[PDB]
Structures are given as structure tokens and as C-alpha cells.
């Protein structure tokens, strides 16, 4: 297969294979592909029916099971293959090989475990200890169906069973009653046979995995069950849970879909109606019965193919695929941070903001790959949907570790950061919300959006380059650097914190105060004819700090020859409208016959390359 997909060309990816699965276009998967993001090097876990050995998974599927496929029998032993797992796995990670359809994360690998009939190898603790980054759970418990006085199923005019509605207060009460036992269960390794589903998924979430669940197919008046309300008991894992509703098209829930309801603050919507994916079918070779007697006499074949299916079970793996693609885009992010990107970049549907039908809205890879749109705290969640104890962290802690460095050390998802996004990344999306940002790691993060997040910005390590704007106060600590040609609210550079305006020679704009503490660094680039770095601030407090002068993009302070070639040049390196208070400690470099000199003109600070009082 010669793939016509090309970097920079989203329409090049819209091939016949691509177009056979309408959900891909609906989540804008082609925009991720065009930027090189396919889920390559990412492992997805599936808990469902045993996935069929299918061409679409050849070389990329590991099963951890008791070595049999899942089969359902009726009263007369008519045998059928459970092709649910195969269908789910295909939506997330079928090969892009020019045949049939392909997954959202078409370069991702798959580890599959059996939901049911697992014997004494359920593979759960193995899955938890694997490098599987995200686990798809396209399963759950059905509520009662409403029955007539005879005991027959009452059907709604829409063709669906009249399911009884779960009640918010009752599902949350059931979860709260399970809390102490589920907490205990989650701390031990998962037994290989009988086991607690709730303890298993809590343990996986606490081992750094993203847990993705189908909302259920129990009608729009319905809400998710107690299992899917586990974050109410364990709000520490809310950011590692995503509940997924079923969209019949880009804007509308399937008539069968369960609503987000009480899970709305950790819920998104994805395509789930008439999804074309991988299946298997148990078939008679002799045009005879498909039953156990025939299976045993070798009369049957289990054949791979494709088929349509509908349900939140088909929506969930779109989000699992989206998560794997984003873990290649943002290899330094933890699962809770990948979750934040998926939630805050979803296209808002229905009632404005987070709502009981669509939650955060339709997952959108085109927006997701440009970074998060919100640093979420409790104050960003409508009270109706707020899970008590959730979103209590003020800071989004972004670790850009630098190429060759380990992230999530001591966890099953521990990995080396080996892509270019690990030394330099940029987020172009506008970031709002009440949270703040903490930049750590030796690498560089550039922010290009018009950011309104209310929290403080802490640069603890490496470079934060502001090219758009932040309304936030910035604190630059030891080994950190504030850079860029954009705007910040205010900054305070501490001992061994640096400010380096521009991308090379440029101006950093500060809406309020620029503060330099003792031992802070101001790295000024200069060129010919009074062109230099500058801070344009409302007001400045210089409690000390060193001004360090170099030529543009030079790794060293001015040499003696460079300084002498600039002798007599004057520069403006700091302007205020309301005044400069105090002075820098010193200005480097300084030589016997040429030095950098600082000139304090009341509202501005000048810099000269001057003689040494001679
Ligand atoms: Ca394919
Ligand atoms: Ca909405
Ligand atoms: Ca500069």
C-alpha cells in the first residue's frame, strides 16, 4: 500500500478507506494525521469480547486471556461469535493499509483482555502493569426494562426498550456505600479470576491510565450507572475517567444514547451511530446449522470481515483513539492532562457550556492538537454538575522534559521523551479558566494564544516563551526563563530566574509591574544603531539583578572585540509609564577599556557600551 497521506495536506488523508468510517471526518482526525500524529508508539488496552485475529490488527495485537474466543449460545445451542471487542478495537486502531476502514489511532498497538469467560487468566493486573496508556470499557450494567402487567417488554415508539431511568441521588449513594471496599480492593494486585470491576478500574486510574467508558444505550432521559459515577467516591481520579455519549451526527445524540447526566464534568460526545468497523462471523461451511455440534465436527469457520454497529460502545473507542493520537502529540503529558485537552477542546453542543446531554461536547482532534483551552478548577464547573472534591488542583503542571529524559518515572507508563515536542512545544489555543500554569522540565513551551486563565504562572525550569498574551502574574524561579515578544500581566524574577525578551531581539510587554530580585538575570541582546531587547512595563521594581549583554542569538556575553565594535551605542532596555524604583546590582560584561553602563532616566533604563571613565 502506497499511502497518499502527506504532512501539511489534511485532504490527502480523506481516502476511500478513511471515508468508509464517517466518525473520522466528524472528529477531524485528518488534521492530526497532516501534523504527523497517528498514535505511533502508543499502546491501547481493551476490556471486551476477545478481539479476532483480523488482517486489520496483524502485527499490532496482543491478547492476555485463557486462549478461547467469546461465543454466545441459545436454548438450542445455536452458536454466535461475540464480535463486539473486534468492532471496538477496529474503531480505535484498525490498520490504515488501503483495505476496509482504519482506526482513529491507526499506528497504535492493542492489548486485549476478555470482559467475560476469562477462566483464571483475566489479564487485568497484567493490563494495569503494561504500557497500555488508555483502557476502553465499552460495557456496563443495563437498568430494568419497564414491563406490562403480563411481563412483556414495553417498547417506545422510537423502536427502543422503555428502560427505567437511574436516579442521580441513588446511583451516587450506591457508589458512596461501595467506597471503603472499592478503596481496599484497589490497593492489592487484581486476582486472575473472580475480581471487582470497580477496584480494577480505580487501580488502573491510579497507575496512570486513562479510563474510557461508554455512557450506555438506555435513552436520553437516562443517566450513567454507579460504576461510571466512581469519581464521586474517588474525585482524585475524575481527570482519569471519560464517559462517552453516542452522536448520530456532528450535533445530535442518538435516540438510544444515555445522557452524560451526573458525569457531565467528565463526559464527552463522539460518533456512535452506524459505525463501520472490523467484525467476525461464525458461519457453516456446509450450509447447515451454526451450533456447538457443528462447531465440534469442524463444519464451522470463524471469518473476519466488516459490519455496521450503533451504540455508546462504538463512541467510546473514538475517544480512546483520540487519546492515543494526543499521547503522540503531547508525549510529556500525563493521562489526566490528556483528559483536560480532550475535554476543553471539545466543540460545545446543545445548551452553552457543560450540559447533562453532551457534557463538554464533541471531541475535536483539529482543536485538541493546538493545546488545552482551559486550566479547569471547581469555579469553571456549573454547580449542577460539580463533583465534590474534584478539580481542586490550581496549577496545570506542564513538564517539557527535554529530548532523552524520562517522564512518569516509577509508573507502568514510564517512558523516555524522544520526539521534538519534548524539547520545544507551542500551544496556539486560547487558554481560559480559573487555573494557572506551572512550567517545569529543561525544555521550552511557547504560548501563542490570547490567554485569559486567572491563575498565576510559575516558571520553575527551562523557558516559557509568551508570543500571544497571558493576563496572569508570572513568577520566574531558579533555572527558569520568561521569553517572547508577547504580553504578560506582571512578572517577578527571583534569584537565578531569567527574563530574555523577544525570539532574539524583541520587546516583552508587561501590563503591570516588572520586578527583578537580587540574583535575577536580564539577558539583553543588542545590535547596531540602538536596536536591543526591551521590557515595556507599566512600572518597575529593581531590587537587584544582573543585566547580561550579548549579540542576537549568541550563546556568550559580548567578547572584547564585539564590545569595542559597539562602543558608543545607546539602547533602551526598560520603559515604564509610572516609574522605575531601585537599580540593577550590575551589568555584564566589563573589560579594562570598554564596559556596559546602565543609565537610569527616571521612567526608562538605558544601556551604553562606553569607555571606562576614559
Ligand atoms: Ca484498514
Ligand atoms: Ca453544551
Ligand atoms: Ca532577546
Numbering used by the authors: 29 to 642
The study reports:
We present the structural and functional characterisation of a subtilase autotransporter, Ssp, from the opportunistic pathogen Serratia marcescens. Autotransporters (ATs) are the largest family of secreted proteins in Gram-negative bacteria with many having important roles in bacterial infection and disease, including adhering to and invading host cells, biofilm formation along with being potent cytotoxins and immunomodulators. Subtilase ATs comprise one of the two AT families which possess protease activity, with the other being the (chymo)trypsin-like protease ATs which include SPATEs (serine protease autotransporters of Enterobactericeae). We further reveal that the activity of the subtilase AT is required for entry into epithelial cells as well as causing cellular toxicity.
A number of SeMet datasets were merged, which were used along with the Ssp model to solve the structure using single isomorphous replacement with anomalous scattering (SIRAS) and molecular replacement with single wavelength anomalous diffraction (MRSAD). One molecule of Ssp is present in the asymmetric unit, where the resulting structure was refined against a higher resolution native (2.0 Å) dataset with a final and Rfactor/Rfree of 16.3/20.1 (crystallographic statistics in Table 1). The subtilase domain of Ssp is positioned directly on top of the β-helical domain, essentially capping the β-helical scaffold. The core architecture of the protease domain of Ssp is typical of the subtilisin-like folds observed in other subtilase enzymes. It is comprised of a globular α/β fold centrally featuring a twisted seven-stranded parallel β-sheet adjacent to two central α-helices and encompassing the active site residues D76, H112 and S341. A disulfide bond (Cys288 to Cys295) connects the last β-strand of the β-sheet to its preceding loop. In comparison to the subtilisin BPN’, the catalytic triad sits at the bottom of a deep cleft formed by two protruding β-hairpins (E1 and E3) on one side and an extended loop (E2) on the other which are absent from subtilisin BPN’. Ssp harbours a deletion, equivalent to residues 98–109 of subtilisin BPN’, adjacent to the subtilisin BPN’ S4 subsite. This results in a truncated α-helix and makes the binding cleft wider, which conceivably allows for a more extensive substrate binding interface. Interestingly, the Ssp β-helix is the shortest seen to date for an AT, comprising of seven right-handed triangular turns (~40 Å in length), with the last three β-strand rungs resembling an autochaperone domain, which previous studies have shown are involved in AT passenger folding. The structural characterisation of Ssp revealed the presence of three calcium binding sites, two in the subtilase domain and one in the β-helical stalk domain.
